Design a protein around this ligand. Structure first.
Ligand code: HEM
Ligand SMILES: C[C@H](CCC(=O)NCCC[N+](C)(C)CCCS(=O)(=O)[O-])[C@H]1CC[C@H]2[C@@H]3[C@H](O)C[C@@H]4C[C@H](O)CC[C@]4(C)[C@H]3C[C@H](O)[C@]12C
Ligand SMILES: C#Cc1cccc(Nc2ncnc3cc(OCCOC)c(OCCOC)cc23)c1
Length: 476
């Protein structure tokens, strides 16, 4: 076996400067020279960057138990009181137990049928309500200012959906608490993105760092917001009426104190703070997905109509769209796939770490080695796509107008293996409904002669420059 190849790097800082502010681009160029498995250093810490579709499937799936770890990074110790299911270094049985708790909690209050309704699930009911409230809230703004920034109001609608799933409450568009955590200068993705020097340069943690201090401050608010919520739930907890994911986790803490010799490492805190990762991933990722979609629709009015054309054909305007129709709207799915692929707003997965001495593609990787997974490289690989820099939803469509299931499965944005996203289905359905309910009823546009920076801003979930020039109009 051999060591992974890689370019020369400075002895003290390594390849920190080569990455720059857009590591996904710098490491994609690098992979073109050194291949799917290459090695770098940020400061003194070695890091292995994985690219290529087959090679990544090899490591995360076929050797998933070897690459299911999390590196011991400082920024992660500041997330969820240093006991985050998703970010802590714990990758053993305690983690797997928490993961199953999250999986069941989501399934029970997202995909399961809502007792109030017969023909709808929890998720479908929530999105329909918020989608309607979103249209009304935008009609107010078109009557007055005549223009708006969609992110400010889409982030609220998306939060109420995941907030109802986790806590059993929704918030008005002007509840400070909400905006105080979601849109009030939240730099989580800014600091957690792979390659943060603070994680590899120990001195940057102690120097004047306004970005890092804001990260510690707001993370402590989240954990205090949780205590408020968990306390409000324990007080009103009805033993036979489980209301949301917070209750299903409290329900599991009760059955735990009833065991003769219960386990101590899966503490009550590590069982309750799971809702924090679900809520944090929930409102952030889906909001960014919808935001990019609106940007692509406004910058490509051609594809906007073709979506609206397929809606009028497949459904019409006599009723709102529903999940059952998702299977019969191929252009909508091709547009969502092309949004995930073109933007790749999650360019890197959360960094992984090797749980044991292993090998990959003929190279030796020791235990504890930090690993980056470059999804952006896949979604923009010249080998897999034709003109990857162009936004072409039609690339996933066959000559007869159906989804090319083989090509759609090469869009990697949710991860793979033992660590893949556990809210993938919720995201794919939630994004579909918001766009379907909206584009059936309204038409978005942006006037000529105004700057609309489509350049992504690097981070865990890449954002774009806020745009205050969006306009909405009802349809005929
Ligand atoms: C477009 C929407 C979404 C995208 C693109 C996305 C993507 C991802 C990615 C790339 C990862 C890490 C992959 C890896 O480490 O190998 C991840 C992890 C995770 N996601 Fe998502 N996600 C989305 C929506 C959601 C939603 C809606 C939820 C919950 C309601 C969620 C919950 C989680 C959790 C808990 C993890 C951590 C799992 C673990 O570390 O074991 N995600 N997601
Ligand atoms: C988040 C904090 C750690 C910081 C951890 C350790 C102390 C824990 C609470 C107390 O245990 C009291 C009460 C016991 C009930 O059983 C469950 C509810 C509650 C409020 C617990 C919830 C949560 O687990 C707390 C707040
Ligand atoms: C991929 C992925 C993934 C996967 C799992 C989880 C998470 N997210 C979180 N997970 C846990 N805690 C989060 C806390 C968060 O807010 C704390 C604010 O501190 C500035 C938070 O903010 C998201 C807002 O985007 C700007 C996200 C949290 C993401």
């Amino acid at each position: 076996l051999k060591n992974p190849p890689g370019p020369w790097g400075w002895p003290l800082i390594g390849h920190m400067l080569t990455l720059g502010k857009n590591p996904h681009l710098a490491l994609s160029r690098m992979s073109q020279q050194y291949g799917d498995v290459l090695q770098i250093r940020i400061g003194s810490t070695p890091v292995v960057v994985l690219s290529g579709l087959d090679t990544i499937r090899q490591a995360l799936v076929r050797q998933g138990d070897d690459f299911k770890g999390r590196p011991d990074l400082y920024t992660f110790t500041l997330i969820s009181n240093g006991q985050s299911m998703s970010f802590s270094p714990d990758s053993g049985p305690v983690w797997a137990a928490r993961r199953r708790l999250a999986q069941n909690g989501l399934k029970s209050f997202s995909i399961a049928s809502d007792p109030a309704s017969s023909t709808s699930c929890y998720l479908e009911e929530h999105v329909s309500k918020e989608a309607e409230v979103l249209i009304s809230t935008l009609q107010e703004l078109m009557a007055g200012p005549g223009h708006f920034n969609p992110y400010r109001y889409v982030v609220v609608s998306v939060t109420n959906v995941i907030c109802a799933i986790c806590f059993g409450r929704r918030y008005d568009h002007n509840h400070q608490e909400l905006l105080s955590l979601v849109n009030l200068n939240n730099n989580f993705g800014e600091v957690v993105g792979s390659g943060n020097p603070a994680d590899f340069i120990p001195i940057l943690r102690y120097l004047p760092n306004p970005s890092l201090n804001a990260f510690k401050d707001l993370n402590e608010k989240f954990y205090s917001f949780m205590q408020k919520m968990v306390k409000e739930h324990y007080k009103t907890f009805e033993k036979g009426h489980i209301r949301d994911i917070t209750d299903s986790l409290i329900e599991h803490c009760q059955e735990k104190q009833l065991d003769e010799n219960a386990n101590v490492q899966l503490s009550d805190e590590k069982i309750i703070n799971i809702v924090l990762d679900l809520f944090g991933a929930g409102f952030d990722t889906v909001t960014t997905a919808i935001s990019w979609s609106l940007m692509y629709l406004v910058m490509n009015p051609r594809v906007q109509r073709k979506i609206q054309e397929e809606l009028d054909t497949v459904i019409g305007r006599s009723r709102r769209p529903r999940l059952s129709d998702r299977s019969h709207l191929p252009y909508m799915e091709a547009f969502i796939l092309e949004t995930f692929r073109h933007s790749s707003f999650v360019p890197f997965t959360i960094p992984h770490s090797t749980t044991r001495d292993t090998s990959l593609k003929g190279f030796y990787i020791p235990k504890g080695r930090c690993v980056f997974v470059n999804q952006w490289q896949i979604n923009h690989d010249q080998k897999l796509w034709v003109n990857p820099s162009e936004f072409l939803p039609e690339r996933f469509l066959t000559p007869d107008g159906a989804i090319d299931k083989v090509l759609s499965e090469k869009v990697i944005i949710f991860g793979m293996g033992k660590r893949k996203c556990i809210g993938e289905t919720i995201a794919r359905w939630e994004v579909f409904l918001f766009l379907a309910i909206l584009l059936q009823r309204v038409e978005f546009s942006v006037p000529l002669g105004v700057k609309v920076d489509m350049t992504p801003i690097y981070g865990l979930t890449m954002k774009h420059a806020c745009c205050e020039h969006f306009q909405m109009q009802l349809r005929s």
